[PDB]
Write an enzyme that holds these catalytic residues in place. Structure first.
Site, PDB file in Angstrom:
ATOM      1  N   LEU A 177       0.879  -1.151   0.000  1.00 19.54           N
ATOM      2  CA  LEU A 177       0.000   0.000   0.000  1.00 19.54           C
ATOM      3  C   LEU A 177       0.935   1.223   0.000  1.00 19.54           C
ATOM      4  O   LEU A 177       0.660   2.247  -0.629  1.00 19.54           O
ATOM      5  CB  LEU A 177      -0.914  -0.018   1.232  1.00 19.54           C
ATOM      6  CG  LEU A 177      -2.105  -0.982   1.155  1.00 19.54           C
ATOM      7  CD1 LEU A 177      -2.864  -0.968   2.438  1.00 19.54           C
ATOM      8  CD2 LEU A 177      -3.010  -0.669  -0.022  1.00 19.54           C
ATOM      9  N   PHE A 218       7.519   3.235  10.541  1.00 17.00           N
ATOM     10  CA  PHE A 218       8.232   2.026  10.967  1.00 17.00           C
ATOM     11  C   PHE A 218       8.508   1.016   9.868  1.00 17.00           C
ATOM     12  O   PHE A 218       9.345   0.124  10.053  1.00 17.00           O
ATOM     13  CB  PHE A 218       7.464   1.350  12.100  1.00 17.00           C
ATOM     14  CG  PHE A 218       7.454   2.156  13.368  1.00 17.00           C
ATOM     15  CD1 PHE A 218       6.371   2.963  13.687  1.00 17.00           C
ATOM     16  CD2 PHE A 218       8.545   2.136  14.231  1.00 17.00           C
ATOM     17  CE1 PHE A 218       6.364   3.707  14.866  1.00 17.00           C
ATOM     18  CE2 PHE A 218       8.535   2.879  15.409  1.00 17.00           C
ATOM     19  CZ  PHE A 218       7.448   3.662  15.716  1.00 17.00           C
ATOM     20  N   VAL A 235       3.600  -0.885   4.517  1.00 11.49           N
ATOM     21  CA  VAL A 235       2.221  -1.244   4.824  1.00 11.49           C
ATOM     22  C   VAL A 235       1.755  -2.090   3.655  1.00 11.49           C
ATOM     23  O   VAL A 235       2.056  -1.785   2.503  1.00 11.49           O
ATOM     24  CB  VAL A 235       1.300  -0.015   5.120  1.00 11.49           C
ATOM     25  CG1 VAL A 235      -0.130  -0.445   5.459  1.00 11.49           C
ATOM     26  CG2 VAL A 235       1.865   0.825   6.258  1.00 11.49           C
ATOM     27  N   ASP A 245      -3.867  16.761  14.848  1.00 11.76           N
ATOM     28  CA  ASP A 245      -3.424  16.700  13.450  1.00 11.76           C
ATOM     29  C   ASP A 245      -4.573  16.301  12.467  1.00 11.76           C
ATOM     30  O   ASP A 245      -4.392  15.498  11.535  1.00 11.76           O
ATOM     31  CB  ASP A 245      -2.111  15.873  13.297  1.00 11.76           C
ATOM     32  CG  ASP A 245      -1.379  16.024  11.968  1.00 11.76           C
ATOM     33  OD1 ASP A 245      -1.621  17.031  11.259  1.00 11.76           O
ATOM     34  OD2 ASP A 245      -0.587  15.126  11.626  1.00 11.76           O
ATOM     35  N   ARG A 296      -5.161  14.559   4.762  1.00 11.77           N
ATOM     36  CA  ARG A 296      -4.078  13.552   4.665  1.00 11.77           C
ATOM     37  C   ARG A 296      -4.196  12.486   5.779  1.00 11.77           C
ATOM     38  O   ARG A 296      -3.692  11.365   5.608  1.00 11.77           O
ATOM     39  CB  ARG A 296      -2.659  14.205   4.631  1.00 11.77           C
ATOM     40  CG  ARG A 296      -2.285  14.879   5.961  1.00 11.77           C
ATOM     41  CD  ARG A 296      -0.964  15.600   6.036  1.00 11.77           C
ATOM     42  NE  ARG A 296      -0.936  16.363   7.292  1.00 11.77           N
ATOM     43  CZ  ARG A 296      -1.372  17.613   7.434  1.00 11.77           C
ATOM     44  NH1 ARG A 296      -1.876  18.273   6.392  1.00 11.77           N
ATOM     45  NH2 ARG A 296      -1.369  18.191   8.626  1.00 11.77           N
ATOM     46  N   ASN A 297      -4.917  12.820   6.877  1.00 14.55           N
ATOM     47  CA  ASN A 297      -5.139  11.932   8.023  1.00 14.55           C
ATOM     48  C   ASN A 297      -6.551  11.322   8.144  1.00 14.55           C
ATOM     49  O   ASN A 297      -6.906  10.761   9.194  1.00 14.55           O
ATOM     50  CB  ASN A 297      -4.667  12.605   9.335  1.00 14.55           C
ATOM     51  CG  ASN A 297      -3.175  12.749   9.404  1.00 14.55           C
ATOM     52  OD1 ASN A 297      -2.422  11.846   9.026  1.00 14.55           O
ATOM     53  ND2 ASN A 297      -2.709  13.882   9.902  1.00 14.55           N
ATOM     54  N   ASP A 340      -5.630   5.875  11.202  1.00 15.89           N
ATOM     55  CA  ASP A 340      -4.681   5.376  12.188  1.00 15.89           C
ATOM     56  C   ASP A 340      -3.784   6.557  12.612  1.00 15.89           C
ATOM     57  O   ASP A 340      -3.322   7.337  11.772  1.00 15.89           O
ATOM     58  CB  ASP A 340      -3.808   4.291  11.528  1.00 15.89           C
ATOM     59  CG  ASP A 340      -2.834   3.606  12.448  1.00 15.89           C
ATOM     60  OD1 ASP A 340      -3.201   3.350  13.635  1.00 15.89           O
ATOM     61  OD2 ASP A 340      -1.724   3.281  11.990  1.00 15.89           O
TER      62      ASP A 340
HETATM   63  O1  LIG Z   1      -2.252   6.499   2.998  1.00 20.81           O
HETATM   64  C1  LIG Z   1      -1.855   6.004   4.042  1.00 20.81           C
HETATM   65  C2  LIG Z   1      -2.403   6.530   5.276  1.00 20.81           C
HETATM   66  C3  LIG Z   1      -2.928   5.668   6.262  1.00 20.81           C
HETATM   67  C4  LIG Z   1      -3.450   6.169   7.431  1.00 20.81           C
HETATM   68  C5  LIG Z   1      -3.440   7.553   7.603  1.00 20.81           C
HETATM   69  F1  LIG Z   1      -3.968   7.944   8.771  1.00 20.81           F
HETATM   70  N1  LIG Z   1      -2.939   8.415   6.669  1.00 20.81           N
HETATM   71  C6  LIG Z   1      -2.419   7.916   5.505  1.00 20.81           C
HETATM   72  N2  LIG Z   1      -0.933   4.995   4.038  1.00 20.81           N
HETATM   73  C7  LIG Z   1      -0.091   4.560   5.156  1.00 20.81           C
HETATM   74  C8  LIG Z   1       0.946   3.619   4.511  1.00 20.81           C
HETATM   75  C9  LIG Z   1       0.320   3.125   3.170  1.00 20.81           C
HETATM   76  C10 LIG Z   1      -0.703   4.217   2.817  1.00 20.81           C
HETATM   77  C11 LIG Z   1      -1.955   3.685   2.207  1.00 20.81           C
HETATM   78  N3  LIG Z   1      -2.891   3.052   2.940  1.00 20.81           N
HETATM   79  C12 LIG Z   1      -4.027   2.579   2.336  1.00 20.81           C
HETATM   80  N4  LIG Z   1      -4.958   1.948   3.076  1.00 20.81           N
HETATM   81  C13 LIG Z   1      -4.906   1.681   4.521  1.00 20.81           C
HETATM   82  C14 LIG Z   1      -3.936   1.904   5.584  1.00 20.81           C
HETATM   83  C15 LIG Z   1      -4.530   1.395   6.792  1.00 20.81           C
HETATM   84  C16 LIG Z   1      -4.046   1.321   8.251  1.00 20.81           C
HETATM   85  C17 LIG Z   1      -2.825   0.480   8.041  1.00 20.81           C
HETATM   86  C18 LIG Z   1      -2.727   1.989   8.166  1.00 20.81           C
HETATM   87  N5  LIG Z   1      -5.731   0.928   6.433  1.00 20.81           N
HETATM   88  N6  LIG Z   1      -5.939   1.094   5.131  1.00 20.81           N
HETATM   89  C19 LIG Z   1      -4.281   2.713   0.982  1.00 20.81           C
HETATM   90  C20 LIG Z   1      -5.350   2.328   0.106  1.00 20.81           C
HETATM   91  C21 LIG Z   1      -4.946   2.787  -1.158  1.00 20.81           C
HETATM   92  C22 LIG Z   1      -3.694   3.416  -1.030  1.00 20.81           C
HETATM   93  N7  LIG Z   1      -3.294   3.369   0.264  1.00 20.81           N
HETATM   94  N8  LIG Z   1      -2.166   3.835   0.889  1.00 20.81           N
END
Ligand SMILES: O=C(c1ccc(F)nc1)N1CCC[C@H]1c1nc(Nc2cc(C3CC3)[nH]n2)c2cccn2n1
Length: 301
Positions: A20, A25, A28, A150, A154-155, A168
């Site tokens: 994703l 850390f 994802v 925050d 973006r969140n 999250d």
């Molecule tokens: O876009 C985000 C993101 C996640 C949470 C947040 F609060 N802000 C941004 N992220 C974080 C890393 C990959 C990327 C991210 N996460 C996606 N889905 C998620 C993430 C989560 C929980 C595990 C975090 N559930 N679903 C997702 C779906 C399509 C593209 N992305 N990108």
């Protein structure tokens, strides 16, 4: 520390597949999990990981940070489903939001601009439904004694059915790093989303969350433009602290802008609560909002 509990999931119940994208850390992933949603044998989940090079301190940090999400159970707040703390790679299982973060979502809606037809910008009804969902996730958090600090597009995350939810906590990324600025020390802060009081004393409350909520409505209305576009990070600080405000986005219904202006009252006490924001728009939410929301739950007072 790092104490395993009832959230612990056996590693063999998890299957990681597509990336994703990167977190603070580590990487994802998207995947599937067994017995994380009651006895469901296969639930599409998101999987947070710790990089293989990380230290013991870093893994325990990841588990304890993530663990704050255990307290929450709201349809408009992204859920923690499980923890894989026994053995490595260290995992945290969460609700999957197929359409990613709200800022990337809104920016993907902007015209391509190479002669092909384009979907018209989101309707006021579609915007109110996003506003109500975000505001509901936020009212639930406040009732649970949390100040977010925050809140920003973006969140906020977007589900497969377009439901928007509070993401999250503390997800770092890299893509929206210019949304933060450090004037002090351990103060790399989201200045363009901050209330005049938080920029002055560095104190955040439910009232300053309400201010940032107004910024999220403006992001929705502008398809995630940078707030205070023509200004440097230093100019934003002075402009907001001195009573300056964001312009009404072009084609933005007065109704949505009035709500922004209410959120942007200089005195925090004059800003509506999230309960008050929902009440003003409850008539406009999809009928299902009355069955899944915190607002309409027994927990709301
Ligand atoms: O876009 C985000 C993101 C996640 C949470 C947040 F609060 N802000 C941004 N992220 C974080 C890393 C990959 C990327 C991210 N996460 C996606 N889905 C998620 C993430 C989560 C929980 C595990 C975090 N559930 N679903 C997702 C779906 C399509 C593209 N992305 N990108």
């Amino acid at each position: 520390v790092y104490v395993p509990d009832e959230w612990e999931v056996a590693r063999e119940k998890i299957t990681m597949s597509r990336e994703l994208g990167q977190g603070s850390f580590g990487m994802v992933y998207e995947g599937v999990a067994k017995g994380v949603v009651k006895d469901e044998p296969e639930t599409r989940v998101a999987i947070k990981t710790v990089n293989e090079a990380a230290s013991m301190r870093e893994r325990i940090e990841f588990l304890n940070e993530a663990s704050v999400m255990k307290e929450f159970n709201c349809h408009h707040v992204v859920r923690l489903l499980g923890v894989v703390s026994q053995g490595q790679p260290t995992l945290v299982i969460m609700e999957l939001m197929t359409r990613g973060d709200l800022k990337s979502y809104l920016r993907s809606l902007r015209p391509e601009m190479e002669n092909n037809p384009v979907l018209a910008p989101p309707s006021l009804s579609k915007m109110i439904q996003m506003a109500g969902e975000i505001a509901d996730g936020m009212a639930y958090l406040n009732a649970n004694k949390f100040v977010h600090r925050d809140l920003a597009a973006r969140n906020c995350m977007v589900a497969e059915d377009f439901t928007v939810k509070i993401g999250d906590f503390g997800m770092t990324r890299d893509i929206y790093e210019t949304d933060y600025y450090r004037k002090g020390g351990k103060g790399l802060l989201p200045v363009r989303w901050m209330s005049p009081e938080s920029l002055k004393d560095g104190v955040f409350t439910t009232y300053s969350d309400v201010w940032s909520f107004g910024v999220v409505l403006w992001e929705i209305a502008t398809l995630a433009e940078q707030p205070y576009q023509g200004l440097s990070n230093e100019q934003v600080l002075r402009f907001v602290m001195e009573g300056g405000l964001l312009d009404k986005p072009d084609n933005c219904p007065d109704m949505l802008f009035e709500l922004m202006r209410m959120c942007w009252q200089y005195n925090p006490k004059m800003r509506p609560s999230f309960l008050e924001i929902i009440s003003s728009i409850k008539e406009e939410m999809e009928p299902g909002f009355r069955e899944v929301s915190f607002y309409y739950s027994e927990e709301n007072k």
